[PDB]
Design a binder for this molecule. Structure first.
Ligand SMILES: CCCCCCCCCCCCCCCCCC(=O)OC[C@H](COP(=O)([O-])OCC(O)COP(=O)([O-])OC[C@@H](COC(=O)CCCCCCCCCCCCCCCCC)OC(=O)CCCCCCCCCCCCCCCCC)OC(=O)CCCCCCCCCCCCCCCCC
Ligand SMILES: CCCCCCCCCCCCCCCCCC(=O)OC[C@H](COP(=O)([O-])OCC(O)COP(=O)([O-])OC[C@@H](COC(=O)CCCCCCCCCCCCCCCCC)OC(=O)CCCCCCCCCCCCCCCCC)OC(=O)CCCCCCCCCCCCCCCCC
Ligand code: BCL
Ligand SMILES: CC[C@H]1c2cc3[nH]c4c(c3C)C(=O)[C@H](C(=O)OC)c4c3nc(cc4[nH]c(cc(n2)[C@@H]1C)c(C(C)=O)c4C)[C@@H](C)[C@@H]3CCC(=O)OC/C=C(/C)CCC[C@H](C)CCC[C@H](C)CCCC(C)C
Ligand SMILES: CC[C@H]1c2cc3[nH]c4c(c3C)C(=O)[C@H](C(=O)OC)c4c3nc(cc4[nH]c(cc(n2)[C@@H]1C)c(C(C)=O)c4C)[C@@H](C)[C@@H]3CCC(=O)OC/C=C(\C)CCC[C@H](C)CCC[C@H](C)CCCC(C)C
Ligand SMILES: COC(C)(C)C/C=C/C(C)=C/C=C/C(C)=C/C=C/C(C)=C/C=C\C=C(C)\C=C\C=C(C)\C=C\C=C(C)\C=C\CC(C)(C)OC
Ligand code: HEC
Ligand code: HEC
Ligand code: HEC
Ligand SMILES: CCCCCCCCCCCCO[C@@H]1O[C@H](CO)[C@@H](O[C@H]2O[C@H](CO)[C@@H](O)[C@H](O)[C@H]2O)[C@H](O)[C@H]1O
Ligand SMILES: CCCCCCCCCCCCCCCC(=O)O
Ligand SMILES: [Fe+3]
Ligand SMILES: [Mg+2]
Lengths: 274, 278, 336, 47, 46, 46, 318, 46
């Protein structure tokens, strides 16, 4: 089934691989070659996760596929000692990368720019930082995070407290600022569009004049219809990127407590006062 | 366990607060998915998707809400999904043939997909009445009538660093194949959005110098060497860009005709764009 | 900024994120080098208490081992001064210098910890050099934070907080953590031991939590550790989820409290004015006074066995639970 | 140039300077009272 | 230097001078309060 | 000097002056509350 | 080689937009509006004018009083040194009352200034709420922005007022400082046993991460369909252009379901405000009806169990 | 002094004065409540 306007858009072309062979839709999903791959990768990784779950516990929150011991270095591990995690990592990476390449096939077919696959490549960059880049720099795949709903929260807790106060990480304070600011911007953007198209009952749908006037009335500046989506993309992508920066520098480029990092600020010759 | 919050030997207040939020989150998710089904619904199940070989309508889950009335500024209560758009889409005879009869097979255009509105060249059925501002002015108008706008946000930047505050008037336009399509004669601005939207050009390079054509700004790469490079379509293809009904106004429909034509170039402008990398 | 390579060690189960990351290029490698022990001189003949006019601590040592100990202590605490750092010129039976009385207390303390605190130091023990490292003063002592008797109607009352301090490892955390726990015996537990609240039985404030946090900031940087080496921070108050380092450092807290309350603070009365801190207090021992940023002080070198005289007798009164933990029998009246 | 004239601006200026005179005189008295209560310029020996 | 006002906009320059001098005067006074020998409200010996 | 009121809107100048005086008076009063000698509500002796 | 809709290449400047006319009782707007080339690259170039009414002025006055109290107490803590203020700028704070005062009014220098700063800050944000509400109503808009702001207010009040009041002490609240309120955030989690195991903190993060996910998805989609004037989203809601169809088809083909030009802003609006609402509820639950969140998670079978890797420590004081 | 109302808008001066005095009255009353000598509700000795 299709949206009542969808038929005319379902044309041939836009693929990067596979050509006509996979260029079709199953229900609403466009398939493409990267959809077949993202399906094989996703099913493989999910079924491997459930196998790992069957060996410890089926409780959804307590399922955990953990990375190997640090003593393994970069070697591939036995399956039940983190080798299962490593296969799931290469399956998830492939699932993410083929998902973005597939969104690139969908982008070209609808004549859209590649903003969505690239914006997703930032999210893939952050996961790659967590499971590939940072474990590489530190020298062991065991530095990646476990695949479990509650077991990866203990990883975040302990890795954060490896630096004794992770709030003082300068790149983390920047990434948190970008995360808080982008949901603030999302609240304003979503709210303002709803406020115009859904005014008080008995009022006409308003214009982009009212949108600019509203924020110029409130804060004295309005970024506009186009600016809100550039800034919205900018804030969320910087949120992802500075997440990657904050974690890649935690351990490969800083092994002490993050509060100590601010010792350079306390020592600036301008304001030492002693 | 014991203490403040215990509701039974196992249940506590935080846990039941959580399940209370689960019920709300579901009702919100269902509500949000219904708001999702006010454009393009009900789904058109074609005959070649169903074992009974009859076209049908699928509501999906959750089913779409009742029609929604947007009262408009000019005094016109429009209903969503709009009846005229649905009626246009279901009755339009596409100039394309499915590459296979089964459901999900892509359409392969028969004639010229760019002028026939196939795929990335497609247009929606929109209003033919040109938009107005809240005050009644013409919303999208060229700078020759919208004379209160001058090109260049900063006069000093436009005068001393014109590269970053350009004025594309008089610029040559090149297509994806590097050929010269013509010269930019005017800029169209949205009085509400306070932005350029179209670069009107003549066809002095590939047609009549007296002909006028609109180039959407998001398809134009205004360079630093007084040349505007359009990657969407070949220079020879600027001649078939849809013309305005009136030389000084554009309806929302013609915006979908013009941006649609350039968007179609992304696949059909030159051979091989449809073809994969490998 | 730092760079790879970094030394990594696993402290907990794979995937828990319990790891230690260290920069090998940040280690001093000279501060932690144990001095080469002298040759074992004879332990024959009459004891020191029979030879010397004024000896109260090293009575049961031979004459040879007494002089070997005296020369070793000179290298450990005042190599650039000589024997006259503590002794009044040529009159070695004189106790006039304050350094002489302090060093006599320092020998009694060095003997005490080496005989009673294997619950923390195991077999390594300590030597004058573990704290002094060749200096007249341990580089890593602490003074009490000044208490200024705030206006109560003025402005800017930091409640020992809100200033970057090297005590708190450059956090805005409470700066009086040493006074509360390394000299006083205030409670360090912050986590309720129940699922549901009992606010009238357990109501630790966030200020008390940040004070215990600030002591943990120090205990991490003071031993070159982090929160993960003693904890699974997901379950912070679970002892069975913690490495054995937590149990060892538990006694390190009570031993440091023992050193400060019973051996260092009694010396405050007779110190010179130049030595005292802003409050007028004596420099006190923290975790880094022995560790200097390494888990094993002096690379875990066992120096005590080489020098008879720094080991005392295992006290019958020792408990390690009588320092603010169900009793205060191992602490004097003052503390702080 | 604001809508004020030379005559209007002169009128505002005179009243403004008179308002500055009254406001400053009240402050000066408030400073003579404050000095009588507790002086704020310490001597070489302090307070 | 009356020609300076054919370069610098005098209305904006006057306002920014008052704003700038407000920050500087407050800053200098605050610096003197922080010193021991020039905090007039504390009254330490000189 | 009267020509200042042709350069600026007098309403704006007054609002700016008063807004400044209000903050300045509050900063000064808070400063005196900080010191021992001039904290009048605290009532500490000399 | 295609234009990426990241910076506006060609800009056009006209007269300053004075805004839509207000009802004949509102204060006049300010007269100050200028155009910025730098801001015009990202979006609308006009800066100002701004409205200021009863609620706006009183919100600013209450907020300035709060900022002056915090700033002067911060400056007083470093002995009034502007240099030491810059050196300690992230570390200084207006400290909340000590625990011994409970919910009573403590002396100024023992949390009294904090309580006044918290009261005036609360008043300014509440008046700012009324300002956002009235500016929308004055234009005939819905009050969605104000209620989304009210949702952020509720977490702010839950953290600083309601939860400390439910706990019976102003000490539980958060100091006005940069690193100190980060110290409060960490200590809060330490005290009540790993806020990670708080389910409403989990949900809060779900909607926070989903908000960044949504804005990244939506912002990228509007820029990608900018060739079809997607960013003119109001026109697409009332008159579905091809951009609205390509945006919906893009996500329908990707993840099997889509939104509309209007429903996407309902998804993002609810994700933004649910993040801050589950945040407030999670804060109100801890300390009051949950003592230790890890022990709560153990009770409800959500804590992972870890095999032996080390010799477990034993509490000597057991 | 009625000429003040030909400069300042009496309508918006009245609103401003009322909201300004509201902020100051709460501030002062709360400052006094936070002193031992003038918290009339705690009633500490004078
Ligand atoms: C709170 C936080 C925690 C919770 C988070 C959420 C939990 C985890 C995520 C779960 C969310 C996703 C779940 C559903 C995924 C979407 C699938 C879908 O279509 O949704 C339809 C559904 C609406 O249904 P509909 O599209 O109206 O259905 C209309 C007809 O049924 C339409 O009829 P039709 O003709 O389309 O029928 C199709 C039928 C016909 O099947 C055939 O005949 C096949 C024959 C081929 C030979 O079957 C199919 O063809 C499709 C089956 C799947 C095919 C997959 C193949 C993909 C290939 C590779 C691509 C990569 C993927 O949309 C949703 O409910 C999904 C969103 C709900 C969750 C939102 C996110 C929540 C986040 C909370 C925070
Ligand atoms: C303690 C935690 C709670 C503390 C809350 C304190 C802070 C309160 C702020 C939170 C609400 C912010 C969002 C409300 C909102 O949408 O405002 C727009 C809306 C704009 O109004 P307007 O300008 O007159 O609209 C003109 C047109 O009608 C244009 O209007 P429209 O068409 O755009 O608006 C229609 C809107 C209607 O929106 C509303 O009427 C407000 C939403 C109603 C529920 C709000 C509760 C949210 C907080 C609790 C959620 C978690 C609780 C879970 C359990 C405890 C844990 O659509 C909805 O129905 C949205 C609700 C989703 C469907 C209902 C889902 C419930 C089913 C599951 C339960 C049964 C199983 O503002 C309101 O209608 C007033 C909301 C007042 C809420 C007070 C609470
Ligand atoms: C005690 C622990 C420390 C701490 C330790 C850490 C550690 C360790 C980390 C963070 C990271 C983050 N911290 Mg922190 N952090 C702390 C407290 C906070 C607080 C707070 C309330 O105080 C906040 C707001 C934050 C905020 C943040 C973010 C800036 C960042 C996580 C976002 C991110 O990485 O996106 C990136 C998003 C992803 C990586 C998701 C990947 C998406 C992939 C590509 C697609 C997946 C698809 C999926 C499989 C589909 C499912 C299937 C379908 C649904 C069917 N932290 C405390 C102080 N923090 C993390 C970070 O920055 O890493 C990059 C990180 O590693
Ligand atoms: C960088 C800015 C933010 C962002 C952006 C972003 N995310 C995106 C996109 C963009 C622009 C998409 O276009 C893409 C999308 O289409 O979303 C609908 C997507 C997406 N982001 C998603 C999730 C997601 N994004 C997150 C974060 C973020 N996304 C950032 C905050 C998170 C977090 C913070 O946790 C999650 C969970 C998906 C909904 C979707 C990508 C779907 C995808 O890649 O599907 C591939 C196939 C699968 C079924 C995936 C599973 C296959 C694996 C083999 C199994 C699972 C392995 C995994 C390691 C398990 C880990 C579990 C434990 C952690 C519990
Ligand atoms: C959905 C939840 C998210 C959210 C939403 C949200 N926030 C919001 C809103 C919404 C919907 C608003 O409408 C409102 C707003 O104004 O948005 C622009 C706001 C807002 N969120 C803000 C902050 C904020 N939001 C945050 C978070 C969040 N906001 C959530 C993540 C945070 C974080 C992460 O901590 C912060 C810090 C404000 C910028 C704004 C509300 C401002 C406010 O209440 O101000 C009150 C008044 C004052 C503070 C007075 C002092 C201000 C000036 C110093 C006065 C200047 C005086 C004079 C005019 C000039 C003097 C100088 C002279 C020299 C000229
Ligand atoms: C000297 O400085 C000058 C004057 C020059 C100006 C400079 C000012 C500066 C630099 C200020 C700096 C400020 C900074 C950096 C502030 C940092 C603030 C932060 C990070 C705050 C973060 C969190 C704080 C929170 C969440 C506070 C919450 C408090 C609340 C919600 C209080 C509520 C209190 C109420 C409602 C009061 C009730 C009082 C009643 C009446 C109930 O009591 C009986
Ligand atoms: C750590 C627990 C220590 C051990 C073991 C020993 N000493 Fe010590 N000593 C220690 C401290 C913290 C201080 C105070 C330093 C200060 O800044 O005030 C001292 C002081 C002395 C002194 C006095 C030095 C002076 O004031 O000039 C002497 C003479 C001294 N210590 C000697 C000494 C000897 C001989 C030790 C071994 C037997 C010894 N100390 C061990 C901390 C510690
Ligand atoms: C070993 C050297 C430790 C390091 C490094 C850290 N901690 Fe610790 N912590 C340690 C011990 C022995 C104890 C028990 C103290 C006692 O006398 O009972 C603790 C206790 C805590 C607590 C209190 C938890 C409770 O029992 O209720 C907290 C909150 C805590 N530790 C936190 C903490 C953090 C955040 C650390 C990293 C910066 C950290 N600790 C390091 C031993 C050691
Ligand atoms: C401080 C750290 C000391 C240094 C350096 C040296 N000596 Fe010492 N010496 C010290 C103390 C505290 C004592 C008292 C011994 C006790 O147990 O109470 C001594 C004692 C002696 C003696 C005995 C003298 C007597 O009692 O009659 C001698 C002979 C002696 N010391 C010699 C000595 C020499 C030769 C040193 C230089 C190498 C030397 N001491 C350094 C403390 C300290
Ligand atoms: C550039 C850094 O690149 C990264 O450097 C570090 C250290 O050099 C390497 O790490 C390597 O040395 C460390 C030293 O402790 C070993 O424990 C680790 O097993 C090994 O892989 C990474 O494998 C490499 O990818
Ligand atoms: C903004 C620029 C910040 C630069 C900080 C450099 C700090 C260098 C020492 C620590 C490293 O890491
Ligand atoms: Fe949008
Ligand atoms: Mg604090």
């Amino acid at each position: 089934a299709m949206l009542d306007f969808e038929k005319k858009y379902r044309v041939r072309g836009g693929t990067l691989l596979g050509g006509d062979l996979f260029d079709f839709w199953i229900g609403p999903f466009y398939v493409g070659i990267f959809g077949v791959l993202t399906a094989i990768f996703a099913v493989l990784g999910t079924v491997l996760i459930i196998y790992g779950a069957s060996q410890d516990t089926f409780n959804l929150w307590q399922i955990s596929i953990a990375p190997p011991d640090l003593s393994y270095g970069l070697a591939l591990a036995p399956m039940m000692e983190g080798g299962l995690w490593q296969i799931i990592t290469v399956c998830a990476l492939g699932a993410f990368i083929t998902w973005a390449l597939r969104q690139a096939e969908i982008s070209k077919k609808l004549g859209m720019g590649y903003h969505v696959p690239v914006a997703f490549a930032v999210a893939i960059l952050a996961y790659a930082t967590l499971v590939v880049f940072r474990p590489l720099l530190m020298g062991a795949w065991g530095h990646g995070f476990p695949y479990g709903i509650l077991s990866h929260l203990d990883w975040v807790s302990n890795v954060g407290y490896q630096y004794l106060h992770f709030h003082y990480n300068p790149a983390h304070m920047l990434a948190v600022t970008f995360f808080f600011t982008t949901t603030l911007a999302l609240a304003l953007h979503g709210g303002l569009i709803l406020s115009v198209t859904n005014p008080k009952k008995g009022e006409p749908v308003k214009t982009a004049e009212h949108e600019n006037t509203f924020f110029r009335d409130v804060i004295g500046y309005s970024i506009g219809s186009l600016g809100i989506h550039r800034l919205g993309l900018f804030l969320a992508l910087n949120a992802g990127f500075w997440s990657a920066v904050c974690i890649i520098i935690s351990g490969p480029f800083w092994t002490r407590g993050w509060p100590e990092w601010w010792n350079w600020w306390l020592n600036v010759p301008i304001w030492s006062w002693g | 366990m014991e203490g403040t919050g215990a509701l039974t030997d196992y249940m506590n207040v935080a846990q039941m607060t959580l399940y209370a939020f689960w019920l709300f989150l579901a009702g919100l998710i269902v509500y949000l998915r219904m708001e999702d089904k006010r454009e393009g619904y009900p789904l058109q199940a074609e005959a070649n998707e169903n074992c009974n070989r009859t076209p049908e309508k699928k509501l999906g889950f959750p089913a779409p809400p009742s029609p929604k009335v947007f009262k408009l500024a000019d005094g016109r209560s429009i209903q969503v999904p709009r009846a005229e758009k649905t009626d246009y889409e279901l009755n339009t005879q596409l100039r394309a043939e499915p590459t296979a009869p089964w459901d999900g097979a892509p359409l392969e255009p028969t004639g010229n997909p760019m002028v026939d509105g196939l795929g990335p060249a497609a247009w929606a059925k929109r209003e033919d009445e040109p938009e107005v501002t809240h005050g009644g002015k013409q919303k999208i108008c060229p700078l020759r009538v919208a004379t209160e706008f001058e090109v260049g946000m900063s006069r000093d930047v436009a005068r001393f660093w014109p590269e970053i505050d350009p004025d594309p008037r008089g610029y040559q336009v090149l297509g994806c194949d590097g050929k010269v399509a013509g010269k930019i004669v005017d800029i169209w601005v949205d009085r509400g959005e306070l932005r350029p939207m179209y670069l009107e050009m003549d066809l002095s390079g590939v047609g009549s110098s007296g002909d006028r054509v609109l180039l959407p700004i998001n398809f134009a790469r205004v360079g630093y060497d007084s040349k505007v490079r359009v990657n969407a379509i070949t220079g020879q293809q600027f001649t078939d860009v849809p013309r305005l009904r009136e030389a000084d106004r554009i309806s929302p429909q013609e915006e979908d005709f013009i941006t649609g034509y350039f968007g179609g170039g992304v696949l059909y402008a030159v051979p091989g764009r449809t073809e994969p990398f490998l | 900024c730092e760079r790879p390579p970094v030394d990594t060690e696993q402290k907990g189960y794979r995937g828990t994120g319990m790891e230690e990351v260290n920069n090998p290029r940040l280690r001093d490698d000279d501060l932690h080098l144990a001095p080469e022990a002298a040759d074992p001189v004879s332990a024959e003949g009459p004891r020191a208490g029979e030879i010397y006019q004024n000896v109260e601590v090293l009575d049961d040592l031979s004459v040879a081992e007494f002089t070997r100990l005296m020369q070793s202590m000179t290298d450990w605490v005042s190599p650039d001064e000589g024997c006259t750092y503590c002794h009044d010129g040529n009159d070695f039976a004189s106790e006039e210098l304050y350094t002489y009385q302090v060093s006599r207390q320092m020998i009694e303390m060095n003997r005490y910890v080496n005989a009673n605190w294997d619950s923390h130091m195991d077999d390594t023990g300590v030597t004058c050099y573990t704290c002094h490292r060749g200096e007249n003063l341990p580089e890593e002592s602490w003074f009490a934070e000044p208490t200024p008797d705030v206006n109560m109607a003025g402005l800017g009352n930091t409640m020992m907080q809100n200033l970057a301090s090297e005590k708190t490892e450059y956090t805005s955390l409470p700066r009086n953590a040493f006074e509360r726990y390394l000299l006083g015996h205030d409670d360090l537990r912050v986590e309720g031991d129940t699922i549901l609240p009992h606010l009238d039985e357990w109501d630790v404030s966030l200020q008390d939590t940040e004070a215990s946090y600030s002591l943990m900031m120090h205990m991490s940087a003071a031993t070159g550790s982090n929160c993960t080496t003693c904890h699974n921070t997901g379950r912070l108050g679970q002892w069975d989820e913690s490495p054995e380092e937590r149990e060892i450092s538990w006694h390190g807290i009570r031993m440091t409290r023992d050193i400060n309350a019973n051996w260092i603070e009694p010396l405050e009365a007779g110190q010179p004015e130049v030595r005292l801190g802003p409050t007028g207090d004596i420099a006190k021992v923290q975790c880094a006074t022995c560790h200097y940023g390494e888990q094993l002080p002096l690379d875990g070198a066992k120096m005590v066995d080489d020098y008879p005289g720094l080991m005392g007798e295992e006290d019958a009164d020792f408990d390690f639970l009588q320092f603010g933990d169900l009793g205060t029998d191992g602490l004097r009246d003052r503390n702080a | 140039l604001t809508g004020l004239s030379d005559e209007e601006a002169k009128e505002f200026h005179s009243i403004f300077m008179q308002s500055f005179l009254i406001f400053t005189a009240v402050a000066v008295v408030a400073h003579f009272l404050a000095w009588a209560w507790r002086p704020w310029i310490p001597g070489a020996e302090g307070y | 230097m009356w020609r300076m006002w054919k370069i610098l906009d005098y209305r904006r320059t006057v306002v920014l001078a008052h704003v700038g001098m407000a920050v500087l005067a407050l800053l200098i006074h605050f610096i003197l309060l922080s010193t021991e020998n020039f905090n007039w409200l504390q009254g330490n010996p000189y | 000097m009267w020509r200042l009121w042709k350069l600026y809107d007098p309403r704006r100048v007054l609002i700016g002056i008063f807004s400044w005086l209000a903050v300045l008076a509050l900063v000064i009063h808070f400063i005196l509350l900080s010191t021992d000698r001039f904290n009048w509500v605290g009532g500490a002796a000399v | 080689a295609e234009y990426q809709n990241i910076f506006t290449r060609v800009q056009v400047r006209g007269p300053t937009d004075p805004g839509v006319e207000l009802p004949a009782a509102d204060w006049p707007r300010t007269k100050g509006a200028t155009h910025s080339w730098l801001l015009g690259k990202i979006g609308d170039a006009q800066v100002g004018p701004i409205y200021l009414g009863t609620t706006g002025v009183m919100s600013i006055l209450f907020g300035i009083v709060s900022i002056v109290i915090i700033g002067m107490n911060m400056l007083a803590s470093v002995d009034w040194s502007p240099l030491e203020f810059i050196r300690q700028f992230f570390w200084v704070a207006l400290e909340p009352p000590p625990p011994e005062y409970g919910l009573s009014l403590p002396p100024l220098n023992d949390g009294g200034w904090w309580l006044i700063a918290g009261f005036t800050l609360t008043l300014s944000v509440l008046l700012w709420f009324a300002r956002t509400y009235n500016r929308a109503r004055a234009l005939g808009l819905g009050t969605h922005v104000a209620w989304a702001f009210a949702a952020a207010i509720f977490l702010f009040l839950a953290i600083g007022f309601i939860w400390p009041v439910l706990m019976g002490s102003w000490a539980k609240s958060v100091p006005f400082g940069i690193f100190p309120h980060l110290d409060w955030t960490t200590a809060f989690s330490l005290r009540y046993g790993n806020l990670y195991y708080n389910p409403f903190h989990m949900l809060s993060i779900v909607f926070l991460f989903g908000s960044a996910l949504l804005f990244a998805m939506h912002g990228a989609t509007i820029l990608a369909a900018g060739r079809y004037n997607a960013e003119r989203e109001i026109e697409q809601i009332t008159d579905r252009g091809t951009a609205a169809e390509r945006s919906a088809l893009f996500w329908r083909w990707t993840m099997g379901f889509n939104a509309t030009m209007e429903s996407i802003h309902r998804w993002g609006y609810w994700f933004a405000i649910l993040c801050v609402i589950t945040g407030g509820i999670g804060i109100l639950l801890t300390g009051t009806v949950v003592e230790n969140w890890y022990l709560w998670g153990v009770h409800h079978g959500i804590a992972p169990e870890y095999p032996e890797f080390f010799t477990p420590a034993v509490d000597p004081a057991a």
